Structure formats: structure tokens, C-alpha cells
């Protein structure tokens, strides 16, 4: 169960989610791909959470300050919903 999610995450291409979120903040090509990728974790709360957490992990070094960090987190919490998916009820994104 926990190992099965480990393997699904190694197989995932969540870079379009990063791009969709960064271009969404700058103001789709990447949303269609990102949502298909997030769909692999739909209705699996622990694994959807870990995916969102790994997106935060990958983006921690590339954000320029706390305020940019909080704006990115906000947009990330809305990404499952904007894909027609359920977010996890609880998921710590403080990396």
C-alpha cells in the first residue's frame, strides 16, 4: 500500500503541474497532462497527499521568499479540485 504509492510516484510526470501552477501565478497545455497524472492518485488520500508534497519539495529551492512560498502552496491546494479531483482532507505542505 505504502510501497505501491512509492512506485506510482516514481512513474509520475508531475512537471506539467509545476508549469501550470507557475504560469497560473504569472498571470491549457500543461493542465490536461497534469490532471491525467494526478488522476493516478484519485480517491487515495495518503498518496494524493504525497504527490502534492513532492511538488512542494521540488519547488522549495526555486521560490524567492516566504510570500512566494505561501502563494504557491495556496495554488497547489486547489490543483486537485481544478482537475475535477478530490484533495486529501489533511496534508502538511510545510517543507
Amino acid at each position, epitope marked *: 500500500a505504502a510501497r505501491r504509492c512509492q512506485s506510482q510516484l516514481e512513474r509520475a510526470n508531475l512537471r506539467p503541474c509545476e508549469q501550470h501552477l507557475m504560469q497560473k501565478i504569472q498571470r491549457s497545455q500543461h493542465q490536461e497532462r497534469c490532471c491525467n497524472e494526478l488522476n493516478e492518485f484519485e480517491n487515495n488520500q495518503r498518496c494524493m497527499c504525497e504527490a502534492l508534497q513532492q511538488i512542494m519539495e521540488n519547488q522549495s529551492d526555486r521560490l524567492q521568499g516566504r510570500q512566494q512560498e505561501q502563494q504557491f502552496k*495556496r495554488e497547489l491546494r486547489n490543483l486537485p479540485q481544478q482537475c475535477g479531483l478530490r484533495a486529501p482532507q489533511r496534508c502538511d505542505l510545510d517543507v
Partner: antibody
Amino acid sequence: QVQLVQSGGGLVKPGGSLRLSCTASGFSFSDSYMSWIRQAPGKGLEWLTYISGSGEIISYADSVKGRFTISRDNAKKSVYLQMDSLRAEDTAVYYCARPSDYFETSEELDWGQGTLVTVSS
Amino acid sequence: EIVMTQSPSSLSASVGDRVTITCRASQSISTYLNWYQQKPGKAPNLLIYAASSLHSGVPSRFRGSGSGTDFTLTITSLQPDDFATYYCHQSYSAPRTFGQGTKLEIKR
């Protein structure tokens, strides 16, 4: 340390209007959904509506759609419920609620003190 | 609206008994099922979230199980403070809905 301080409510005639307000501290109000729940005398809990942090996502229970309006002011850390076209059925204690996290699925956790709303001629 | 149907509506038991409350959803809600306790005059307290996860401070005697449409709250060894009303609650889709509630009374 979460505090939810409600105000308003009271007595109103059928067909009248009341406005409930709720002020929050101790969490990131602007990132959190917020919801209103009521409980009539001797009845069960009845979920009514919630509002996303941005205000762009809103849902209403079938029993209230078209009569109540939820809104929020993140700068005041407050969420409001405009109750219109009230009926005797609406008599209940009304609760402000905060969820356990900052997603649209996060379950209610912290409750305001409750406000008694009485609809009677 | 997703209809949440709890059974039984009432239940009597003694200190030390094993209680089980069931909740049936109108449709598949995955694990997005929550359980609350309410004592009279007081606001509800969350016991379980995500259909299996204990909230902080909730004693271990409370246990939740189920996925999809059928769910169960169990109290392994009932205690004096456990006599109250219990509600299930889905946050799978809005508008959210509580079950009608289950009152747990003292047997004699």
C-alpha cells in the same frame, strides 16, 4: 488557540431577514474554507453552506439554496451568512465552523459558540 | 445530495460493552467519511476523519472502518463518558451531509 466568535441572530418575523457574522483567529483564515451548520430543537445536525478561502467556490444545501447567502472578508477574518425569506422551519442554533486543514475536503473541526435564531410572528 | 443513512437510531448498552454504529452513503464516497460525537448543549467533537484516522486526543477505544458506501464506528470497551449522540459525515462532495444521528443510552 483557535477562536470562532459569532454574533447576530435573534428574533425575526417570517419572511424577514437576519445576518449572522463570525470572526476567526488562530489560523490562516485566508487559506481556509468556512462553513455554517445548524441544529433545530431536538433534531440532528444540518450542514448548510461553505465558502472557499478565495470566495470563488460556494455550495448550499438544498433546504437553503436561493434563500441564504454566504460571504467572507479575509481582511476582517470574518465570514457572514445573510438569511432571507426566513420561515418557522429555520428556527435553530447556527454554528460557525472551521475545517481541520486548507482543502475543500477538509472536515469541520472547530465550532463557534452558536447563535439562536428564532423565526416567529 | 449524498444521503447518509445511519443505523441504528438508538442503542442501549452498559459500561464495558462493544458498540458498533453503521453508516451507509447514497453513493461511493471513497474514504471521505467522518464521525462526530455530540453531548447535549455542546458542539460536536470530531472522533474520526478519512474513515479510519483518529483525531488527536480521541482515545484508542474508538475505531472507524470502511470504504465506498458502507462504514462502521466501533467502541471496543464502552466508558461512562461515551453515552452521547453520534453522527457520520461525508466531505466527498458539496453540499456536505450528516447522518440522522445515533443516540447511545445507558442500559438497565
